[model samples]
Target: AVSTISDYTEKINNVKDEEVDDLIKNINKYNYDLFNGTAENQLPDYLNIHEGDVLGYIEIPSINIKLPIYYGTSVDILKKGVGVLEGTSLPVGGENTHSVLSAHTGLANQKLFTDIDKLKDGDVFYLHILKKDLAYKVNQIKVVHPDEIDELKISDDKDYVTLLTCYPYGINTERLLVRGERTDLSPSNGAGFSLPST
Candidate 1:
């Protein structure tokens, strides 16, 4: 019910006027150009965040899954916990933003995402960023081979977060995707939210 690029989003928000803010479309650009097209570069100046930056945590109450969401998906980050798949939105919550997070299963010792395959239609998941809870309801479930992974399409009017993990538990030859559309909690009476601006 509350998450960051660890801190880039905060600082970028601080520099609200930064042209980089127009990056509303940056995710799509990256996705279309694709992941790892060239230069296995570190976080560049354009992005002040990097691998293993603790953005926040995600809670999938149904599966009792809770894990830290790191900034990037590196071998180092995956072992730690969940990571924002680069080339996707950063989970800052806005129209047309589709943030994709990936994790590993069958880690031998770690139980992270081991049960992600259990989520069903309409299941709700929560992301806590900057201590504010953002709710999303699961609306789609799709399993894809690594080859079909790039089918990440972004709709201009949608806000989404897709949780990705290995399928079939021990046999990780395929990828499982549990996607949720952002659910704006109303009933300001029952729903609670915090402002990162403060």
Candidate 2:
């Protein structure tokens, strides 16, 4: 086994119990950027979040989660969401780039991306606040071991998003990789934005 199953379960439980409150509070405080040509009203100042500064807010209606995103490995992010994996070559956004992000799928109390695999091709997922609503058609799914870092490498001049999670839900020997491309983007002001490939 890559890692003991109990290890994962315990870690998840601890995070949820200790950190779930702050996570929910930060989420409720921030206003998500919804593309489709109109602006959503900003949240109150006491909420302590700036509009347009957030990378995005992910909402999985089925799971009833709406969480904000950040650019790096901040403790605040880890408490509320997944911090960007360190020492990875994935770019956040660039031409032919792969902005890869990983999180515990079945995290103890903060199951951020737990339902990622349930997303199908042609399904719509929102990356609100970035003025982007990514519509993806799942292209491929594969299992890879931690040592296979090459599978996570960015492609030349291709813009993509790669989401990673440990395979088999509660185990960690292999990774579950989901690959997709942005099909359309709606600006905050109700107009389509030019697709940025570079």
Candidate 3:
């Protein structure tokens, strides 16, 4: 996992500025397939999978949360780990991009996101990808219906990360959205924003 994150980060950093837009767009092109049941989860067959596969992992030290983040939101993936929601910008941190990562709470064995509600404002989470570790501060937390698509829209003015888990812990009626924004910390460096050792 560390090697994969390092390699992917290097590749992203080397992408030319002019190609970033097209690169991001292309990476998300097949996201709709996950929603339509076209991209069913299977073994990690590199020869058959497309790009943007298995981005990396997300870590919230405060809640002892760590989960792999796959490109597409397949039922199988969610059962095992977290899924980056389709139709949202990639988790590559930058201005105007918002990545919404969804996971299942109240799983029989794993806690998954069960303690996410305990995360209060001002808390921090880290996204480990492409060898870069970006820190995000909890700016907002709210409960919204599943149909509230507007709540997940990408911001044109700021970089943000949103974590979604089922609401009311065991009940899966509404969605719990934990929204955060990127801090001014340098990429791959968590100097001043470090969390307490778990």
Candidate 4:
């Protein structure tokens, strides 16, 4: 059966804040390893992981991309789905926060972020949090050297999300950054709704 955004909306909206807090705590306990290059294929002892333990799912309707978002950037996690970068703000969605998500491009067997480069200004993507659905519109897309730290910093003025994948398709020596600003706080984009500005 085909899954629609409406199918997940109720489940997301019913998730309790306490559950999200717990998830965040669990994610933080091992996220440091993600940055230290020791996170590959490792799952913390405290976490009783099961299938469908995804932090959330990200969907870009324009590109027909929908993938589960895991909490850490471990190789194992990335192999399975998109990984939320450690040390970044959580996807709780509020003012002054930015959540950065990363995925591998040009994987032989997976589409992954292969088409992320096609996203342009005004394109919309959806982040499905535990019980919240946040919409973001692409505002900028650029390529930068891997050491360009400024490109990944969280904004103090607004809520945003950044999507990162390696650049140049198969020759990935640089990074491709796609930045999106939150445009809608509501889950359902019914009639009379319009995207907000950056």
Clashing residue pairs for model 1: 1-133, 1-134, 2-127, 2-128, 2-129, 2-132, 2-133, 3-128, 3-129
Decide which is better by lDDT, 1 or 4: 4
> What digit string (tens of lDDT, one per residue) describes model 1 on residues 1-198?
123344534554464453444443443344333333432224444545667766577888887777777777777555556888766767766666678888843361145445777798888888865444688888988878787745465666888899887743455367778899988655345865687994
* lDDT value, candidate 4, whole model: 0.67
Model 1: residues >4 Å from true position, as ranges? 1-46, 105-114, 168-172, 186-198
Full-model lDDT for every candidate: 0.66, 0.47, 0.67, 0.67
Candidate 1, poorest ten consecutive residues by summed lDDT: 32-41
Off by over 4 Å in 3: 1-52, 105-110, 168-172, 186-198
Screening candidate 2 with a backbone cut-off below 3 angstroms (N, C-alpha, C), the clashing residue pairs are 12-108, 33-129, 37-189, 37-190, 38-190, 96-157, 96-158, 121-138
Q: Count the backbone clashes (under 3 Å) in each candidate.
A: 9, 8, 2, 1
Model 4 lDDT, residue 111, Cα? 55
Candidate 3, after superposition: displacement of residue 34 in Å?
17
lDDT of 1: 0.66
* Cα lDDT, model 1, residue 20: 43
Q: What is the TM-score of each predicted model, taking all chains together? A: 0.68, 0.51, 0.66, 0.67
Question: What is the overall TM-score of model 3 with all chains considered together?
Answer: 0.66
